[PDB]
Design an enzyme around this catalytic site. Structure first.
Site, PDB file in Angstrom:
ATOM      1  N   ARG A 103       0.848  -1.204   0.000  1.00  0.00           N
ATOM      2  CA  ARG A 103       0.000   0.000   0.000  1.00  0.00           C
ATOM      3  C   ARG A 103       0.887   1.259   0.000  1.00  0.00           C
ATOM      4  O   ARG A 103       1.837   1.297   0.748  1.00  0.00           O
ATOM      5  CB  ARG A 103      -0.827   0.069   1.312  1.00  0.00           C
ATOM      6  CG  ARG A 103      -1.579   1.405   1.498  1.00  0.00           C
ATOM      7  CD  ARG A 103      -2.765   1.135   2.443  1.00  0.00           C
ATOM      8  NE  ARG A 103      -3.565   2.293   2.834  1.00  0.00           N
ATOM      9  CZ  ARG A 103      -3.345   3.058   3.926  1.00  0.00           C
ATOM     10  NH1 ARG A 103      -2.298   2.856   4.725  1.00  0.00           N
ATOM     11  NH2 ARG A 103      -4.179   4.055   4.210  1.00  0.00           N
ATOM     12  N   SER A 147       3.524  -7.260   1.333  1.00  0.00           N
ATOM     13  CA  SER A 147       2.253  -6.852   2.006  1.00  0.00           C
ATOM     14  C   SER A 147       1.071  -6.830   1.040  1.00  0.00           C
ATOM     15  O   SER A 147       0.773  -7.879   0.485  1.00  0.00           O
ATOM     16  CB  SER A 147       2.357  -5.531   2.809  1.00  0.00           C
ATOM     17  OG  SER A 147       1.317  -5.480   3.808  1.00  0.00           O
ATOM     18  N   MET A 148       0.396  -5.675   0.834  1.00  0.00           N
ATOM     19  CA  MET A 148      -0.713  -5.618  -0.141  1.00  0.00           C
ATOM     20  C   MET A 148      -0.287  -6.321  -1.459  1.00  0.00           C
ATOM     21  O   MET A 148      -1.086  -7.069  -2.037  1.00  0.00           O
ATOM     22  CB  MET A 148      -1.182  -4.178  -0.451  1.00  0.00           C
ATOM     23  CG  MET A 148      -2.395  -4.121  -1.383  1.00  0.00           C
ATOM     24  SD  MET A 148      -2.795  -2.424  -1.875  1.00  0.00           S
ATOM     25  CE  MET A 148      -1.344  -2.131  -2.964  1.00  0.00           C
ATOM     26  N   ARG A 157      -4.161  -6.825  11.931  1.00  0.00           N
ATOM     27  CA  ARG A 157      -4.617  -6.223  10.701  1.00  0.00           C
ATOM     28  C   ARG A 157      -5.887  -5.425  10.939  1.00  0.00           C
ATOM     29  O   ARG A 157      -6.049  -4.303  10.393  1.00  0.00           O
ATOM     30  CB  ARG A 157      -4.855  -7.258   9.600  1.00  0.00           C
ATOM     31  CG  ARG A 157      -5.481  -6.553   8.349  1.00  0.00           C
ATOM     32  CD  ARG A 157      -4.377  -5.779   7.476  1.00  0.00           C
ATOM     33  NE  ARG A 157      -4.925  -4.684   6.646  1.00  0.00           N
ATOM     34  CZ  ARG A 157      -4.281  -4.144   5.587  1.00  0.00           C
ATOM     35  NH1 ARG A 157      -3.081  -4.599   5.212  1.00  0.00           N
ATOM     36  NH2 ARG A 157      -4.828  -3.132   4.912  1.00  0.00           N
ATOM     37  N   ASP A 175       8.915  -7.202  12.353  1.00  0.00           N
ATOM     38  CA  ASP A 175       7.775  -6.568  11.638  1.00  0.00           C
ATOM     39  C   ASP A 175       6.585  -6.432  12.589  1.00  0.00           C
ATOM     40  O   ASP A 175       6.074  -7.442  13.018  1.00  0.00           O
ATOM     41  CB  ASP A 175       7.350  -7.403  10.424  1.00  0.00           C
ATOM     42  CG  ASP A 175       6.437  -6.654   9.452  1.00  0.00           C
ATOM     43  OD1 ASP A 175       5.715  -5.723   9.874  1.00  0.00           O
ATOM     44  OD2 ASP A 175       6.392  -7.020   8.229  1.00  0.00           O
ATOM     45  N   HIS A 233       9.142  -3.972   8.977  1.00  0.00           N
ATOM     46  CA  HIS A 233       8.210  -4.099   7.873  1.00  0.00           C
ATOM     47  C   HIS A 233       8.819  -3.685   6.525  1.00  0.00           C
ATOM     48  O   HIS A 233       8.406  -4.224   5.514  1.00  0.00           O
ATOM     49  CB  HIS A 233       6.956  -3.248   8.151  1.00  0.00           C
ATOM     50  CG  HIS A 233       5.794  -3.543   7.260  1.00  0.00           C
ATOM     51  ND1 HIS A 233       5.297  -4.817   7.090  1.00  0.00           N
ATOM     52  CD2 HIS A 233       4.986  -2.719   6.546  1.00  0.00           C
ATOM     53  CE1 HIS A 233       4.261  -4.770   6.262  1.00  0.00           C
ATOM     54  NE2 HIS A 233       4.055  -3.512   5.913  1.00  0.00           N
TER      55      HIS A 233
END
Ligand code: NA
Ligand code: NA
Lengths: 261, 275
Positions: free
Chosen positions: A20, A86-87, A119, A210, A238
């Site tokens: 993202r 991630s995304m 999340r 993370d 992260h």
């Protein structure tokens, strides 16, 4: 709708899908050159919601999966190697669910396969921030980015920190309708059972420090995938692929070298 | 009972009163909480165990907290002199001291100017200077306050949780729900006092000054602490000629609250042997 892409080199194609807020540019400082040097062709691109599409809203994971499939088709690079974070890992994961034929193998960094609590807390805090219209002062915004993306060991290193803080001015993240909508492009249900059907070889990389997508959640994705294995990088937050680029590139390249195109 | 002692005169020539609590009859210990912490922060986990060990516990509300939450214009030296006044008023010099973060920093600076008031100390989650990361965190907090901007409640809870608790806590969904419910019973009000407490911190490297502190000291670092990283506490221990360092694994910045048994055990073991 076309998405901006950057195409480099010749050889086995690797498509990179950023998380993202990340433009395709996120991959160039640390990933693309190393992959070009090992002989791959690299494709990076601007996810829907970024840059030219930053005012897009109402799109979904499925839309983004289709955008990615269309890119692979438009460039005639099926099946491609895929690297997602991630995304982006979630996009890759869902791509392998509906069109396994477009992907030969993948690396999934900082990923998850369900709507876990961490999340949920992240979804709510971020949506709230957006809906309030509140602007975080710059140093306060920079401090949160530091705390959320980097390992302990990095915060201890006065030189690095001064770079990360410099780096933040070179990487502004604008609060846009696109960034907001990308927030919804995440698991809303338990997708582990659907991942049990993915044949492709897959490396899941978890980053040890993370806090946004804790490492143990990538181990759940790796366990689900029949050909998936899990690897953990120590001392990486992260943004592990930017923070420990050598360790992460060595891991991806060894894995991609072991597998057929 | 409702006890107060007279605090030091501040730089604007005012004298205020500060609330304290005094329990037990044994060897006196003065607890100095961190920024935003009332004296009561020590009661759920430290005070019962020290009383059971035959110590007398003095806790109190730092300047900038509770009834003085609107205090401003004070400095580290003001808080050092308050803590001295508490000690001199109770006539317990030289006293054992326990400080955490801002409270550890106050204890350190008290030991520098008034060593006869302190026999021995435990310093938790401390530092003797701000590294680059911690200087920046301090400036970010000042900026948030001075801007007038209110953090939305859910964002605020999330940041509080991430900053204060260990990884192992953060990965335990049940424990997370517990801490989060507990945030609502321990609201941290944004006040002029809380803002002024943010400058009660090293502005310079204080470590050379700590080299002259003779008293025995235990410095406790919390392994997962990002607000005051444990290597900064080890530098303080290294500076102190009779200081010793101990690290608690799986402890965030609120380690004395999160792993009370390991922290308490270590403190009692240290105090049984000092001097
Ligand atoms: Na597996
Ligand atoms: Na020492």
């Amino acid at each position: 709708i076309n998405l901006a892409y950057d195409d480099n080199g010749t050889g086995d194609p690797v498509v990179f899908i950023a998380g993202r807020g990340g433009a395709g540019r996120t991959w160039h400082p640390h990933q693309v050159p190393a992959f070009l040097a090992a002989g791959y062709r690299c494709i990076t691109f601007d996810n829907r919601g970024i840059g030219a599409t930053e005012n897009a809203e109402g799109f979904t994971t499925q839309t983004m999966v289709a955008d990615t499939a269309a890119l692979i088709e438009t460039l005639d690079i099926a099946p491609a190697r895929v690297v997602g974070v991630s995304m982006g890992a979630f996009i890759a994961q869902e791509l392998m669910v509906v069109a396994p034929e477009l992907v030969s193998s993948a690396v999934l960094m900082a990923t998850r396969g369900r709507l876990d609590r961490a999340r949920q807390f992240f979804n709510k805090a971020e949506a709230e921030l957006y809906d309030s219209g509140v602007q975080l002062p710059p140093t306060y915004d920079a401090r949160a980015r530091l705390l959320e993306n980097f390992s302990r060991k990095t915060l201890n290193d006065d030189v690095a920190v001064g770079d990360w803080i410099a780096m933040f001015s070179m990487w502004p993240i604008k609060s846009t309708p696109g960034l907001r909508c990308q927030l919804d492009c995440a698991p809303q249900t338990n997708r582990l059972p659907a991942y049990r059907n993915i044949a492709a070889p897959v490396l899941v990389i978890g980053f040890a420090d993370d806090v946004v997508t804790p490492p143990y959640l990538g181990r759940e994705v790796a366990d689900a995938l029949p050909n998936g294995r899990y690897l953990q990088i120590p001392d990486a937050g992260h943004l592990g692929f930017f923070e420990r680029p050598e360790a992460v590139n060595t891991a991806m390249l060894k894995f991609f070298a072991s597998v057929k195109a």
